[PDB]
Structures are given as C-alpha cells and as structure tokens.
Amino acid sequence: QMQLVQSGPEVKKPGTSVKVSCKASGFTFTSSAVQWVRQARGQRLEWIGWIVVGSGNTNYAQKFQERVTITRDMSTSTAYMELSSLRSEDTAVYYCAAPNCSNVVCYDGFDIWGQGTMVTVSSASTKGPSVFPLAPSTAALGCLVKDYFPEPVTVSWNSGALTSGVHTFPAVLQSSGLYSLSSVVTVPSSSLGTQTYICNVNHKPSNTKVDKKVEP
Amino acid sequence: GQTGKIADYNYKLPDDFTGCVIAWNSNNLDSKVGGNYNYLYRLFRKSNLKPFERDISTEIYQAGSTPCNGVEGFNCYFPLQSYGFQPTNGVGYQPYRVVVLSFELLHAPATVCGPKKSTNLVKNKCVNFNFNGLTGTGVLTESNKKFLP
Amino acid sequence: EIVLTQSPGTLSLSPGERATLSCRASQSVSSSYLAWYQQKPGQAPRLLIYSASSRATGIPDRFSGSGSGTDFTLTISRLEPEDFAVYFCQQYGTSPWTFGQGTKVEIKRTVAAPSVFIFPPSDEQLKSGTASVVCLLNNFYPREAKVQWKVDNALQSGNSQESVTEQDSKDSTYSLSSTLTLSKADYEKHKVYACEVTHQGLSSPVTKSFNRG
Ligand SMILES: *[C@@H]1O[C@H](CO)[C@@H](O[C@@H]2O[C@H](CO)[C@@H](O[C@@H]3O[C@H](CO)[C@@H](O)[C@H](O)[C@@H]3O)[C@H](O)[C@H]2NC(C)=O)[C@H](O)[C@H]1NC(C)=O
C-alpha cells in the first residue's frame, strides 16, 4: 500500500536543533509538496511551513520565517525539517503532510500524514519514578507515580486487566519539570479486608521497576 | 532514446540520430564566483516531448484539477527553475556547454563537405593523374593553347 | 487578518444529530482550497472533505458540507455513535495557512451526581520530599466542576494542580483529581484541609474532610 514514514521520538536540550524526516513511499513523490505542522499538548493546530519536492519553492510562516530550514534531497525521495534554537515552549509533537499525487493528476488534499515525532527540552536530569500509596478509611485505593524525567510512562496492575474503575490520568508538568500522575481504582465492595491489593508500576525508558503494596 | 530530466523534458533527441555530439567542459567561461544564475530549465510538463521540439512556455503548470488564475500555490506551479551553478559545485556538477550537430539528406544538392588533395604535380614523366573529376594516365607537359576564361 | 474562528465550541447530544459546525471566515477566500480534519485524540488526523464541495476517496454516512466565499459549514446527518472526535478547519488558498479552532462532540448522559473523596497523606510523606494531598471527583457528566481547597481560615490557590481523564466508554462519565503541595517544614500550620466542589447534580454544596488524630 501507500503511506508515509516519520522518524522516532526526540528528546533535546535548549540550544540545539531537530531533524525529522518524511519518507514517502508508494507514490510519485517527485510531483508533490510537503507541509510541516506542529501540535502541542491538547491544543489548537498551527502551521510551520511547506516546500515543493520539485525544488525551488519554499514558503514559511511569518513567525516561522527564521531558525527553520526544510531540506528536501531527491536521492532518497524524502523530506527533512530542521528547526534550530530549541526553546522551552517548543516541547511539542510534529506531524507530516503530503498529497496523493499519481503521475498525471495530483490529489487536491493532504490525504496522507506522518505519525508525528515529538520533541521535549528540559534541564536534562533523568530521574527514576517513585510510587506513593493512597488508601481510604464503596472505597477506592491507588498509587501515584511522581518525580520521573519527561518521557513515556506505563502504569499496570501486574496483569493488564481488572479495569473495574482504574483511572490513569495524564502526566502533569510541574514547576521543576518533573512528571507525575495518579491511578486510583475503586474496590468492588466493602471487602477491602481480604483479597490482594497491589499497584505494581512498570517502566522501561529507565532501569526502574518499583513495586509497592497498598494497605488501609 | 534515453530518459531523465534532459532528453525527455526540455530537449528531446530523436532516435536514428544523424549528427554529432560534442560536450567540452568549461569552468572559467561560466560558473561565475558566488553563483551563476542566468540559464533556466523546465521542471513540470503535462506530457513528454516529440522528437526535435522546442517548448518555450511561461504559463504556470497545474498539477491537480482546480484552475488557477496566475497564482503560485498548490496544484499550480511554475516549471522554470535556475541552474545552481557554483564556483566549486563539484566535478559532476560543473556547467557543461554542449553542441549537437545534425546531418541530413534529401532530394536536393549537397553543399557541405571538405576534400583535400593539394598534391604537387610532376611533368615529363609517365604519371597517373586525377584532376577534379576526370582521371587518366599520361605525361603532362606545358602547352601554348588558349582557353576561354 | 486571517482567522478560521469556529462558532460552535462544543456539542453534547445523543447518537443521531444534525451536527452543524460553522467556520465563518473574515477575509474573502475562494472556496476551492479548504479542508476539514477529524483528529481522534491519540493519533494523527484524517482527511474528510476538501475543496468545500467534494468528497474523499471513501467516507461513511455521507458527510456533506458547503459554504460560500466567507461562509463555511459542515453537517453530519444522523451522527453515528462512533463519530466523536475533534474537528479542525484548514485553508490553503492563500498564505499563511491558519488552521481551525477546534470543535468537540460528546454524548448526553442526563447529568448525574458526582462522588468526592479525599486521600490523607500516608506515613511515607513525612520522610519524603514534599507532602501532597489529593481529592478525587468521579462519575459526573458535565465538565463544570469547580474545586476549592479549604485551608483552615484561608481560601488560597497558590499552587494546586488539576488533572482530567478522557470520556469513559462503559460508564460515559468523567474523573478529576486535585493535588496540593504544601511546605514540608511542619505542615501543622493549619489542621483543617478539605476540598469543596459545586455541581449541578449536587444542590447543597458538599464539605467532607478528616482531621488528623
Ligand atoms: C492514491 O492514489 C492512487 C492512484 O490515484 C490510488 O490507487 C488506486 O486505488 C484504487 C482502490 O483500490 C484502485 O481501484 C481498484 O482497481 C482495481 C484494478 O483491478 C479494481 O479491480 C478495484 O475494483 C478498484 O476499483 C485503483 O486501481 C488504484 N489506482 C491505480 C492506478 O491502480 C490510491 O488508492 C490512493 N490512496 C489514497 C490513500 O488516497
């Protein structure tokens, strides 16, 4: 089939650049053009710029006029974005855009988009997560993951099941740049004195695997 | 025959070629310092080129299906683009001047070719002569006859 | 100046609706270069309609929408149960290509009462970095949920973090968490800590807490 490929995750520091590539496959990429956009965390969409694979036609936004270069290259039939001078507000997700042009006819819309890479700049102090238990005194108990470096995180219950009210909330960016969230599940009934209540937390970007029990 | 950006989009070479091809390199008569941007080439065309065709056109090419009134946006692009000549672009990217010749025959007199004999003559000796056209054998000698101009 | 301001902010109706969304522009732009995008959160958006009056390669339930030079709108007759995502305008008739504001749709579950309950800090918090107190709100349809921290003889919001989950599937309800971080020195400056919330399905405000002892 026909699709678009984008690069993987990126984590950077303030004062560097990014390099996101758009591999086009399954269609005539030469008679096409590529647009770059940026999506923040749950906000409105914006526009960065666009270029033409045919070369010699690049248009950038008024605020995206500087500190950005969109190299194209024809040997591998791809498209690259380079945005320099990374800033704290620039922690976001980048997407890709391209039409489905086939020889004689170019598709009037940007049908195919890339998966979208991500960029995060911070103090660059990787730290393992910590687990804090929360217990009641018709009941709910849970554990809170806190103080881990900005990165994808996983919360499980040693089985990937028992979804009887598990509430996993999105990570929150605090004043120190660290990440935290909480996961609380309600007990089936007033039988909290028996059975097993465990809030195992699994992590893989860092070599941290902490497990803690929950008691009243 | 062949394919690519050239010989297929801007100067098509017919098959069964009757002519000559010369491409002598140049790096001082062209590729001025800083950048040489004087020549242009076509990028996008709605079709290929018939043999021996000169497609000089400045209309904006349309790629999709939406008509464009002289606006340079999506699905409407200007094919002409400039050579990226540079002082040190690269050995494979130096400006090359090319001249292609064309020989042709038809039901008409031929008026271009070069002969050369310019051989000194000898008199009073049994010699095999060939003047322009006629041939023979004999002993050439000076005479006192008078020819009309 | 170019905008794609969208008149409808959010929609909340049962499956099956006219589903009218409006994207009136400010400056006149030809209705030939414009697109709609549907982004279900968590993955890339998809192409739905382009060139004002057209259709994609394949779209379900016959999405239809047309406008004029300065009027743009889309309707979705018989809104299917699955179609619930974010909708974005986009125009590329002229640079810059400003995008759409965004619209949200969701189901109606006839306003149910929420549940509020607190978690007092455990033993580990007095030897950890900072002691934090959390309140949990569960099982409420409306997004109107105001959380106020009841410090003893003080109503302050110096540092309080709110977290919201996405819409439930089996229960179709919402869950929120409120977290406070206070000075680690003694935490004994005020012995009364509580969280109040006012909701449509609550009438009289609820105040519940547990003083340490
Ligand atoms: C991007 O554009 C290309 C070409 O414009 C699209 O490829 C086309 O895909 C359709 C759908 O499968 C093909 O139609 C099928 O053709 C077979 C031929 O036997 C027929 O039996 C089927 O019933 C069906 O009609 C079409 O042939 C194909 N184009 C070509 C030149 O083969 C592609 O789907 C587009 N992709 C996107 C994401 O827009």
Author numbering:
A (entry chain D): 1 to 52, 52A, 53 to 82, 82A, 82B, 82C, 83 to 100, 100A, ...
B (entry chain C): 413 to 561
C (entry chain E): 1 to 27, 27A, 28 to 212
How did the manuscript describe this experimental structure?
The virus is decorated with a trimeric spike protein (S), which comprises an S1 subunit that binds host cells and an S2 subunit that is responsible for membrane fusion. The S1 subunit comprises an N-terminal domain (NTD); the receptor binding domain (RBD) that binds the host angiotensin-converting enzyme 2 (ACE2) receptor; and two additional subdomains, SD1 and SD2. In this study, antibodies isolated from convalescent subjects who were infected by the Washington-1 (WA-1) strain, which has an identical S sequence to Hu-1, were investigated for reactivity against WA-1 and variants of concern (VOCs), and we defined the structural features of their binding to S. The two most potent antibodies, A23-58.1 and B1-182.1, shared highly similar gene family usage in their heavy and light chains, despite being from different donors.
